[PDB]
Amino acid sequence: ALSEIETRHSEIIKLENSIRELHDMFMDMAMLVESQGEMIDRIEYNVEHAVDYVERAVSDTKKAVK
């Protein structure tokens, strides 16, 4: 009976639908997580060293009061 085989169909496509769109979000995600990764590399970097320069600044201030 087509009324039964046709019903199955409409349900599978509408299933395929919601699918591909969701998967789209997975892709964009990996694309977003990446951009953020390279941006944090510069953050930590500038911060890490920022602590190195200050570490030398404080070491001098301490020896500037003795």
């Binding site: 199955r8 349900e11 509408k14 979000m25 600044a57 500037a64």
Partner: protein, 61 residues
């Protein structure tokens, strides 16, 4: 229709978590960028602190 409707929403429910993932992951991107403008702006003054702390070294040491 059995396995159909079964696997049907099985993903419609996975379509939600990503809606949360894409957002929670994008909200961070902007917050980190905010720290990139302050953290650097900080050391920017550190360049002054080092020199300033040195000028104090040649006055009391």
């Amino acid at each position: 229709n059995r396995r159909l409707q079964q696997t049907q929403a099985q993903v419609d429910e996975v379509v939600d978590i990503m809606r949360v993932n894409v957002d929670k992951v994008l909200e961070r991107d902007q917050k980190l960028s905010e720290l990139d403008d302050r953290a650097d702006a900080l050391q920017a003054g550190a360049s002054q602190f080092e020199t300033s702390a040195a000028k104090l070294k040649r006055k009391y040491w």
